[PDB]
Amino acid sequence: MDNLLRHLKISKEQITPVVLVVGDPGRVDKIKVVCDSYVDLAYNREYKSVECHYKGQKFLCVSHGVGSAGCAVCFEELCQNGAKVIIRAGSCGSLQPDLIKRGDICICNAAVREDRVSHLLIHGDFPAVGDFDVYDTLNKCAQELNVPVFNGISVSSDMYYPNKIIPSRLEDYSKANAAVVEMELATLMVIGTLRKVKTGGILIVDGCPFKWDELVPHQLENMIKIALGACAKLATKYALE
Amino acid sequence: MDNLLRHLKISKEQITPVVLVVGDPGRVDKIKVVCDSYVDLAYNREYKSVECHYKGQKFLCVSHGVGSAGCAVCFEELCQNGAKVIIRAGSCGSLQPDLIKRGDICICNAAVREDRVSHLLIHGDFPAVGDFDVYDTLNKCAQELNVPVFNGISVSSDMYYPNKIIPSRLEDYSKANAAVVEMELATLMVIGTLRKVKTGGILIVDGCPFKWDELVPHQLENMIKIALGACAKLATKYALE
Amino acid sequence: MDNLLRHLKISKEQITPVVLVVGDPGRVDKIKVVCDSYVDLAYNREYKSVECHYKGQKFLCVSHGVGSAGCAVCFEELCQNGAKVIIRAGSCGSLQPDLIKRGDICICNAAVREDRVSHLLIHGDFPAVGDFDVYDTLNKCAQELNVPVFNGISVSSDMYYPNKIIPSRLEDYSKANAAVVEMELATLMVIGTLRKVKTGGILIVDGCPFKWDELVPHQLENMIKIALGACAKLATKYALE
Amino acid sequence: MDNLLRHLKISKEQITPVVLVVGDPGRVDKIKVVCDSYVDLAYNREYKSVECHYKGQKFLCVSHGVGSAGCAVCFEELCQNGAKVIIRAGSCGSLQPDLIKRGDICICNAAVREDRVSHLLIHGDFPAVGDFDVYDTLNKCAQELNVPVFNGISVSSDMYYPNKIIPSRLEDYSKANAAVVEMELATLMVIGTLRKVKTGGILIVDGCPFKWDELVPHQLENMIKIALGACAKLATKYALE
Amino acid sequence: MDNLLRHLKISKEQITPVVLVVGDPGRVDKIKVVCDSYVDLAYNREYKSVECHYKGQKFLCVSHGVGSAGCAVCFEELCQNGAKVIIRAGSCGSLQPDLIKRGDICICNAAVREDRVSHLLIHGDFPAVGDFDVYDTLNKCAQELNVPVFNGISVSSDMYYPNKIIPSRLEDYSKANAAVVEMELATLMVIGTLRKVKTGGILIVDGCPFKWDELVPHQLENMIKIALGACAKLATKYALE
Amino acid sequence: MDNLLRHLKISKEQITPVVLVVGDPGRVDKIKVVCDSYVDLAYNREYKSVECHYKGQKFLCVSHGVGSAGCAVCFEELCQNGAKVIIRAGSCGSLQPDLIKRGDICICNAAVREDRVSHLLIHGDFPAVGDFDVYDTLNKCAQELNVPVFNGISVSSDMYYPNKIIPSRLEDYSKANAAVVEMELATLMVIGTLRKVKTGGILIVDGCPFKWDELVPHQLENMIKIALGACAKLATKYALE
Ligand SMILES: O=c1[nH]cnc2c1ncn2[C@@H]1O[C@H](CO)[C@@H](O)[C@H]1O
Ligand SMILES: O=c1[nH]cnc2c1ncn2[C@@H]1O[C@H](CO)[C@@H](O)[C@H]1O
Ligand SMILES: O=c1[nH]cnc2c1ncn2[C@@H]1O[C@H](CO)[C@@H](O)[C@H]1O
Ligand SMILES: O=c1[nH]cnc2c1ncn2[C@@H]1O[C@H](CO)[C@@H](O)[C@H]1O
Ligand SMILES: O=c1[nH]cnc2c1ncn2[C@@H]1O[C@H](CO)[C@@H](O)[C@H]1O
Ligand SMILES: O=c1[nH]cnc2c1ncn2[C@@H]1O[C@H](CO)[C@@H](O)[C@H]1O
C-alpha cells in the first residue's frame, strides 16, 4: 500500500464504489464524451482509467482489453481495492442468428465458463452469475429510456478463432439457448462472487460467429446511457464516506 | 401420447403452466392443507401429484424425492409436457454457520453443479441459474408478507454423507460465499434452461453439514405462503387457453 | 445414537445382517406378500422399511427410490448401522436388443460408474463390482428354481432422458458388451466395497432405451424368490448374536 | 493372415482356447519345468511363447513384460486370434501391511484402472472386473490343494516409482480396502470384457510399496499349480475342434 | 480479403516473414527507438503495429497485451496472413528464487499449458515447444553480444493473482524445474506448431511470485538487441519475393 | 544401496554419465556389434544391459521393452543412479503418409503425452520436450555422416491397437503436424526434465498406423551410428571423475 494498482496504475483512493469496465480503451474516450464531467487518471498498457461524473455521481470507467486473464487482473485489482459494483459494457456476437441480430442489446445474467482463470479460482461446478439487483437496475433503465433489450446467457469463449481439429462447442451452447458469445464476462462474475462484488453486463451484437464465412451507433448510444444510468443509479446507495 | 407421464402417472392435460415441486410426498399433503381447494391426481413411487388452487389460480404440487437423477425424471416429464414455471420449495443446510442459522429462508438464484445428470445434458462450463422474474416475484412476496429472506448460491451436492478419502468441497464453496447446501436445484435450473422453463427455488435451513458431529414450523408456514403466493402470481399470466 | 436412522427412520437395532433394497415402495408391499411373516417398521419419504421372514430367517426389505444420491443415503445408513449384505432387486432396460428381451433376468456383477456420488467417494479409476459369494448364491438359487438368467455388466446411468446436445454413451457401452441399463447399482457396489459390505443385484428387463421411439409378472415372481431365497441363504451365516 | 502375430511371433493356429500370461520370460521357463510336456514356440522382445501340457490338456504360457501398453499388445494379439480364457499369474505388493504379508496369495476379481490404454479403449466409468467362473475355478483349486488365499481388488498402477510432486493415491485405495498393487491386470480385464474373453488373475505378495524405505518359493510353487490346474480345468470345456 | 486484419488493423501485405510481438504497446515504442528506421502502421485497442528496420532487414513489431485469449487473436491473425517466425520478448517472474534473480534473461524453449485457448485448439497432451532454430539463433546472439542467459521451461499461467481456495500449482512446477512464470508463451507455441510457424521467446526476470508478500534497463537493453538481432538473422532467409 | 538396480540388475557404479536405451533387447546385441568393444553387464526380464565403447568413450546401452510404465522403471532407475544423458533410438510409424515414408529418420524434440505414468508424475499441462543440446548434437552427426533426417513431434500413444468405440486421436495429431507415432518418448522426456537429465531421441519409420489395413537396414545402420556418435560426442564432456 502507497500508490499501488500494479496494472491500472491508479491509486487505491481513486477506486470508487461503482466501476464501468469496457474492453477497448478508445471507448473509454467515447464514454468520457457523453458524461457531464471527467478526470483522466492513468493510461498503462491496455488499461485506460478515468473518473466519470454523471447525474450527480462519480464512478470509474476502466478498460480491460481482449480476453479473460488480462481482464481478470483488472477486475482483481478493482475488488481488492474497493469496487463494490462492476458492470461491463461491451460487444458480443449472436448465438441465435434469426432472433438476435446486429445492433440488438442483451442484458446478460449468466455465462458459460470457457476460460481457465476462474477454474484456477474455483471448481468448474460453480455458476458464473451476475447479481440480480445490478441486473434489475440495468433492465429498468432500458425501459425508462424506451429501448428494447434481450436478456440471456452469454458464452465467454477464449477461442475467438476456432480450429479444424477440436469441436468448437458454440453450436452446442446455441442448441442450449445461450444468446450471445463474448470473451470476458464469466471471469467478472466469478471473481465478483468470490470477492463480494456485484457485477453485471450489457452487450451490443456485433455479428454472428456462425456466418463469418459469408445505424448501430444509435444502439451504441443507447447502451452507454443504460450503463451510465445504472452506474449513477447504483452509485447513489454508497455515496457518503 | 395418450395418458402418459411415465413416473408422475398423471395425464399431459393435467400439467398446468406453473408447478411447485418439493422432495417429500408427505409435504405435498402439508401444502395441500393451506390451499383453498385441491384435486389429488396420482401417487406413484416417490411422486405424489396434486392440483392446487390458491388465490384464483391452479397449479400442480408434485414431489421428486431425494437426489438429482430421480428429481431429474420428474422435472423432465413436466417440461416435456408443458410446465412453464417450476419453483422448488425445500430444505437445505447452512454453509455460513454464524450468519445463516436454523429456520432462516434463502431464495436462491444459482447453484453449484455437483451432480452428474446435468453434465450428461450440458458441458459443466454452463451455469445453473434460476430465472430472474421467478426470483424477483418470489422475493417480493417475502417482503409483502413481512418475512426476512437471504438470497444466495446453493450447492447441489449428491454426496450427503461425505467420506474419509476424497476432499468434500463444501468448505471450498463456503470460503467462496455459497450460502446453503441441498441436493436437487442445479438440475432443475439446467433442465429448465435447456427446455425453456423458468425455474426458481426457496429453502428453509434445516441445519449445518459442518457441525453434524455436535419454532421453525412458523418459518415453514411462511415459506409455503411465499411459494404458493409466487405460483399464484406467476400462473396469472398464462391463465386462458 | 438413540433411535436414529435419519432417512429410513428405523432404529439401529432393527438393521439386520442382510437387507433387500428395491426402488419403489409399492414393491416392498408386493414382496411383503410372498414372505412367511413380516413386521412393518417405518415409511418416510421414498423409504418404506420392513422386517421380512422367509425360510427361518429375518432380513429387512427397504426401498431407495429412483436414482443414486437418494439411493446412496439409504445404502449409507444401512452399512453405517450394520448391514453386512445388500442385494438389490429391480428393473433395468436391455443394452442387447436381440439377446436380452422383456422379462429376462440378469444377475449382474459389475456396473458402469455413471453417477457422481461414488466419484465424491472414490476416484473413478475404481471398479464398481459386486461380491462373488452374493453373486454365486444368487446364481444357484436361479438354477435350483429352474429359471434362466443372464449374467452381466450393468450401466448405472443418471440420465434417464437423454438429450439432443451431448452424446449419450449407451451405444458405446452396448458395443462394449454391457448387458443392461439401470440407475442405482454402481453406487451400492462402491459404498459396499468402501464400508465392507457384500452387495449384489438382480434385475428384470423392462424394455430397451434404444427403441423407446417405437407374462412378465411370472418372471417377476421368479426374481423375488431368487432374491428372497438368496437373502435367506445369506442370512443363515450371521444368525446368532 | 498367414503366419502373423506381430509381437508374439507365433502362428494364429498355435493360439489355444486357454492362455497363461506372466510378466518375466524367465518364469515362462520355471513354469515350463513343472508341466508334463512342452513345445517352445517363439521368443521375441519381452514375449516368450510356449505350448504347455498339463493333466491331459494344452494351453499357451506367454509373457507380457512390465506394464500395461506393452502387456496390452500381448493380450490384444491373443484375443484377436482366439484365446477364450486368460489368467495372469504374477507378483504384487501389499496395500494392507499387517494382514497381507510377503508370500501370501491373492486371487483378484477387480482392479483400479490406473493405466491409460484401457481409457483409450473405454470410458473410465467402466469396471475392470474378471470373470466369475475363472475366479471360482481358480479359488477351488486353491482349496483342493489346501493353500490359503486372499481375495480382493488390485490396483494396477503405472507409476512404480512415485514422485515428490503429485499425490500417489495408493494410500487412498488402501483406505478404500484394495488389497494389492500390481501393474497389468486392469488392462487384461478391460480388453477381455471388450473382446469377449474370460480373464482372471492370481498374484504372490512380493512386498509393500509403503515400507520400501525400511520360503516364498514354496508359495510360488503353490501358485503355479493353482494356475496350471485352473488352466487345465478351464481348457477342458473347449477341447475338441 | 481486402485490407483486413480485424484486430491489428493492418493490411495482409504489411505482414512480413518475421514478427516480434511484445505485450505492452509502450514497449513497441521503446523498441522503435533502437532500430535503424521504422514505419508506424496502426494502433487498435491493445495492438500497436510497426515495421522495424534493423541490420538491412524489415520485420513487424506488434504488441498482444496481457493474457492468452487476447494474445491468441494477435498470433492467429499473423499466421493466417503469413508470419513465418514469431519471437516474443517480454517479462516473467522467477520460479527459482535463488538462481534466477531480477534482471536475468531466459531463453525459453517450452512452457506449461495453463491457459484454455490452446486446449480449444488441441488436446492438452500436446507439448508447447518453440522451434529449435529460433531457439539456437536467439542463443548465439546472446553469446556474440557477451550476455549471460538462462534457458528453460516457462509456465504460462492465466492466474496472475492466486486465490485462497484452489492450489496454485506454481510450487508444483518449481519443484519440477520450470524456470520462470509468464502469461502468453504456451499459446504462441501451440498456434505456431498448428499453423506451421516457428516461434521462440525470451524474457527478463521482473520478480518472483513467491515473495510478493515481502540497473535492469541495461539487461532490458541487452534483451532487445538479442531479439532484434535474431529477427534480423531470421528474416534474412526469406528476404526476396 | 549395495549392488542395487532392482530391474536392470546392474550396479550403481556401472551407470555411466551417458546411456543409449532401445526397446528390444535383441537390438542391444545388434548395437553391441558395431561398437569398438563391450562389456555385457546383466539380462533381467525385458532389460538387457551392456557397457558400449565407441570412439574413446564408454556408455551403457540398455533396453526398456514395449510401452511407458515398463520403460519408465528403466529410465527411473538410470537417473536415480546417475545417467546425465539418455537418448532413445527406436522405431516409429508415420503420421505424415506421403512425406515421411518407410526408412526415413526423425530426430524428435517433443512428444504428445498419451501415457499415464508422466501424469502421475506431473500435471498434463507440462511439455514433454527433449534437451536442445542433445537434439543439436544428434542433428549434426546426421549431417557429418551425410544422412537425411526429419525433425518433429512424436506422439507417444499407449494404444497400439485402436478400438471400435473411442476416437483414436492419431488423425487429430496428424492434422496438428505431429510427424510420427511411437510408445515411450514422452515418458523419457518428462522423467528427465523432473530428475535433471538431458534426453533426446531418434527413430526409424517402420510403417504408418493409417494404412495397416492395406533396404531399411541401411538406414538402420545410419541411425545407430548417428546415435552412437552422439553418445560418444556427449560422453566426452563428463569423462573424468
Ligand atoms: O463473435 C465473437 N466471438 C468472441 N468474442 C466477440 C465476438 N464478437 C464480439 N466479441 C467481443 O469483442 C471482442 C473481439 O474483438 C472480444 O473482446 C469479445 O468480448
Ligand atoms: O446438510 C444437507 N446436505 C445435503 N442436503 C440437505 C442438507 N440438509 C437438507 N438437505 C435437503 O434435504 C434432503 C435430505 O434429507 C435433501 O433432499 C436435500 O435437498
Ligand atoms: O431404460 C432404462 N434406463 C434407466 N433406468 C431404467 C431403465 N429401465 C428401467 N430402469 C430402472 O427403473 C427405474 C426407472 O423408472 C430406474 O430406477 C431404473 O433403475
Ligand atoms: O509394489 C509394487 N508396485 C507395482 N508393481 C509391483 C509391485 N510389486 C510387484 N509388482 C509387480 O512386479 C513387477 C515389478 O517388477 C510389475 O510388473 C508388477 O506387476
Ligand atoms: O509473476 C508473474 N506472473 C505472471 N506473469 C508475469 C509475472 N511477472 C511478469 N509477468 C508478465 O508480465 C505481465 C504482467 O504484468 C504478464 O503479461 C506476464 O507475461
Ligand atoms: O505404428 C506404431 N504405433 C505405435 N508404436 C509403434 C508404431 N510403429 C513402431 N512403433 C514402436 O515400435 C514398437 C511396437 O512394436 C513400440 O515400442 C513403438 O515404440
Cβ proximity of D69 and F158 under 8 Å: yes
Cβ proximity of F87 and F138 under 8 Å: yes
- Sequence letter at residue D18: V
Distances (CA, A) of C88 to A8, A138, C8, C64, C95: 62, 54, 16, 10, 19
Alpha helices in chain F (DSSP H): 26-32, 68-79, 132-144, 170-175, 185-195, 216-235
Straight-line distance from the first to the last Cα atom of chain E, in angstroms, rounded to the nearest whole number: 20
Residues 6+ apart with CB under 8 A from A66: A23, A46, A183, E7, E45, E46, E65, E69, E70, E73
Spatial separation of the C-alpha atoms in residues F121 and E80, rounded to whole Å: 37
How many Cβ atoms are within 10 Å of B81's Cβ, its own excluded? 17
Nearest Cβ partner for A66 among E70, E160, E161: E70
- Sequence letter at residue C237: K
State the burial class of residue E8 (Cβ atoms within 10 Å of its Cβ: 0-12, 13-18, 19+).
Answer: buried
Check whether D25 is labelled as a binding-site residue.
Answer: yes
Nearest CA in chain D to E176: D165
Grid cell at residue A86: 462492476
Handedness of CA E184, E186, E187, E189 (dihedral sign): positive
Cβ proximity of C195 and C79 under 8 Å: yes
- Sequence letter at residue B236: T
Spatial separation of the C-alpha atoms in residues A78 and A88, rounded to whole Å: 13
Cβ proximity of E154 and E106 under 8 Å: yes
Q: Domain holding C208: CATH number?
A: 3.40.50.1580
Cβ proximity of F120 and D159 under 8 Å: yes
| Nearest C-alpha neighbor of C173 from the set F162, B122, D194 | D194
| Nearest C-alpha neighbor of E16 from the set E27, E8, E26 | E8
Grid cell at residue A147: 429501448
- Residue B89 CA, chain-centre distance (Å), reads 4
Residue D162: CA count within 13 A, CB half-sphere: 14
Spatial separation of the C-alpha atoms in residues A214 and E7, rounded to whole Å: 19
DSSP three-state, residue E172: helix
Active site residue F206: yes
Grid cell at residue C153: 455388466
Phi, psi of E173 (to 5 degrees): -75, -30
- Atom number of ligand 3 nearest to Cα C212: 1
Q: Do chains E and C touch (3 or more CB pairs under 8 A)?
A: no
DSSP code of residue A164 = S
Grid cell at residue B55: 388465490
Pocket lining: E223 vs ligand 5, CB cutoff 6 Å = no
Taking 3-state DSSP, the helix, strand and coil percentages for chain A, each rounded to the nearest 5, stand at 30, 30, 40
- Sequence letter at residue C150: F
Spatial separation of the C-alpha atoms in residues A120 and C106, rounded to whole Å: 45
Spatial separation of the C-alpha atoms in residues C20 and C38, rounded to whole Å: 13
How many Cβ atoms are within 10 Å of D51's Cβ, its own excluded? 17
Nearest CA in chain B to E164: B175
What is the enclosing helix (H) or strand (E) of A79? helix A68-79
Distances (CA, A) of D59 to C92, D6, D37, D40, D234: 38, 20, 11, 12, 10
| Nearest C-alpha neighbor of C114 from the set C128, C100, C95 | C128
Spatial separation of the C-alpha atoms in residues A143 and A150, rounded to whole Å: 12
Spatial separation of the C-alpha atoms in residues D16 and E158, rounded to whole Å: 56
Cβ proximity of D85 and D18 under 8 Å: yes
E strands present in chain E: 18-22, 37-44, 47-54, 57-63, 85-94, 105-112, 128-129, 150-156, 180-182, 198-207
Q: Show the 3-state SS of chain B.
A: CCCCCCCCCCCCCCCCCEEEEECCCHHHHHHHCCCCEEEEEEEECCEEEEEEEECCEEEEEEECCCCHHHHHHHHHHHHCCCCCEEEEEEEEEECCCCCCCCCCEEEEEEEECCCCCCCCCCCCCCCEECCHHHHHHHHHHHHHCCCCCEEEEEEECCCCCCCCCCCCCHHHHHHCCCCEEECCHHHHHHHHHHHCCEEEEEEEEEECHHHCCCCHHHHHHHHHHHHHHHHHHHHCCCCCC
Phi, psi of E182 (to 5 degrees): -140, -165
What is the enclosing helix (H) or strand (E) of E141? helix E132-144
DSSP three-state, residue F40: strand
Nearest CA in chain F to C174: F165
Pocket lining: D71 vs ligand 4, CB cutoff 6 Å = no
F119 close to D (CB below 8 A): yes
The angle, 0 to 180 degrees and rounded to 10, between the axes of the packed helices E68-79 and E185-195 is 30
Grid cell at residue A8: 491500472
Spatial separation of the C-alpha atoms in residues B60 and B14, rounded to whole Å: 8
Spatial separation of the C-alpha atoms in residues F111 and F190, rounded to whole Å: 10
- Sequence letter at residue E52: C
Spatial separation of the C-alpha atoms in residues D96 and D93, rounded to whole Å: 9
| Nearest C-alpha neighbor of D167 from the set B165, B72, C73 | B165
Spatial separation of the C-alpha atoms in residues E199 and E134, rounded to whole Å: 7
The distance of C51 to chain D (nearest Cα, Å) reads 30
Residues 6+ apart with CB under 8 A from A152: A106, A107, A108, A109, A178, A179, A180
CA angle A135–A138–A143, rounded 5-degree value: 125
Residues 6+ apart with CB under 8 A from B15: B5, B60, B78, B81, B82, B83
State the burial class of residue B206 (Cβ atoms within 10 Å of its Cβ: 0-12, 13-18, 19+).
Answer: middle
Matching residue, cell 515428490? D164
How many residues in chain A? 241
Matching residue, cell 546417475? F82
C177: left (phi over 0), alpha (psi -120 to 50) or beta: left
DSSP code of residue A209 = G
Check whether D183 is labelled as a binding-site residue.
Answer: yes
- Sequence letter at residue A219: Q
Q: Given the DSSP bridges, would you call strands E180-182 and E150-156 parallel, antiparallel or unpaired?
A: parallel
For residue D122, the chain F residues in CB contact (below 8 A) are 163, 165-166
Spatial separation of the C-alpha atoms in residues B184 and B181, rounded to whole Å: 10
Cβ proximity of E115 and E186 under 8 Å: yes
Spatial separation of the C-alpha atoms in residues C89 and C105, rounded to whole Å: 10
Grid cell at residue A109: 445474467
Grid cell at residue B151: 438470497
Spatial separation of the C-alpha atoms in residues B50 and B67, rounded to whole Å: 21
Cβ proximity of F53 and F143 under 8 Å: no
Q: Given the DSSP bridges, would you call strands C180-182 and C150-156 parallel, antiparallel or unpaired?
A: parallel
Asked if F132 and E136 come within 8 Å (Cβ–Cβ), the reply is yes
Residues 6+ apart with CB under 8 A from D120: F114, F157, F158, F159, F162, F163, F166, F168
State the burial class of residue D241 (Cβ atoms within 10 Å of its Cβ: 0-12, 13-18, 19+).
Answer: exposed
| Nearest C-alpha neighbor of E51 from the set E85, E86, E15 | E15
Alpha helices in chain C (DSSP H): 26-32, 68-79, 132-144, 170-175, 185-195, 216-235
Asked if F160 and D69 come within 8 Å (Cβ–Cβ), the reply is yes
Nearest CA in chain A to C167: A172
Dist. CA C68 → ligand 3 center (Å)? 12
Resolution reading in Å? 2.0
Cβ proximity of A83 and A41 under 8 Å: no
| Nearest C-alpha neighbor of F85 from the set F104, F113, F57 | F57
Phi, psi of E140 (to 5 degrees): -80, -25
Handedness of CA B160, B166, B169, B171 (dihedral sign): positive
**Radius of gyration over alpha carbons of chain B, in Å?**
17
Asked if A66 and E7 come within 8 Å (Cβ–Cβ), the reply is yes
The number of folded domains in chain F is: 1
Spatial separation of the C-alpha atoms in residues A73 and A69, rounded to whole Å: 6
DSSP code of residue A46 = T
Grid cell at residue F73: 522403471
Pocket lining: D152 vs ligand 4, CB cutoff 6 Å = no
**Radius of gyration over alpha carbons of chain C, in Å?**
17
Spatial separation of the C-alpha atoms in residues A155 and F144, rounded to whole Å: 55
Cβ proximity of F101 and F236 under 8 Å: no
Asked if F120 and D166 come within 8 Å (Cβ–Cβ), the reply is yes
- Sequence letter at residue F137: T
E110 close to A (CB below 8 A): no
Concatenating the DSSP letter of every residue in C64-121 gives --SSHHHHHHHHHHHHTTT--EEEEEEEEEESSTTTS-TT-EEEEEEEE--SSTTTTT
Grid cell at residue C136: 454365486
DSSP three-state, residue F182: strand
Spatial separation of the C-alpha atoms in residues F67 and D183, rounded to whole Å: 12
Spatial separation of the C-alpha atoms in residues A121 and C234, rounded to whole Å: 50
- Sequence letter at residue E87: I
Spatial separation of the C-alpha atoms in residues D46 and D32, rounded to whole Å: 17
Residue D30: CA count within 13 A, CB half-sphere: 16
Cβ proximity of A123 and C116 under 8 Å: no
Spatial separation of the C-alpha atoms in residues C185 and C107, rounded to whole Å: 12
- Sequence letter at residue C16: T
Spatial separation of the C-alpha atoms in residues A200 and C21, rounded to whole Å: 49
What is the enclosing helix (H) or strand (E) of C154? strand C150-156
Q: Given the DSSP bridges, would you call strands A198-207 and A85-94 parallel, antiparallel or unpaired?
A: parallel
Spatial separation of the C-alpha atoms in residues C79 and B58, rounded to whole Å: 44
| Nearest C-alpha neighbor of E67 from the set E169, E230, E188, E166 | E188
Q: Do chains D and B touch (3 or more CB pairs under 8 A)?
A: yes
For residue C172, the chain F residues in CB contact (below 8 A) are 165-166
The residue segments making up the domain with residue E178 are 1-241
| Nearest C-alpha neighbor of C75 from the set C213, C191, C169 | C191
DSSP three-state, residue F205: strand
Spatial separation of the C-alpha atoms in residues A5 and A42, rounded to whole Å: 10
| Nearest C-alpha neighbor of A85 from the set A191, A224, A188, A197 | A197
Q: Show the 3-state SS of chain D.
A: CCCCCCCCCCCCCCCCCEEEEECCCHHHHHHHCCCCEEEEEEEECCEEEEEEEECCEEEEEEECCCCHHHHHHHHHHHHCCCCCEEEEEEEEEECCCCCCCCCCEEEEEEEECCCCCCCCCCCCCCCEECCHHHHHHHHHHHHHCCCCCEEEEEEECCCCCCCCCCCCCHHHHHHCCCCEEECCHHHHHHHHHHHCCEEEEEEEEEECHHHCCCCHHHHHHHHHHHHHHHHHHHHCCCCCC
- Atom number of ligand 5 nearest to Cα E157: 4
Cβ proximity of F48 and F7 under 8 Å: no
What is the enclosing helix (H) or strand (E) of E188? helix E185-195
CA dihedral (B103, B108, B113, B117) in degrees, to 10, reads 90
Choose, from F133, F136, F158, F206, the residue flagged as catalytic: F206
D93 close to F (CB below 8 A): no
Phi, psi of C21 (to 5 degrees): -105, 130
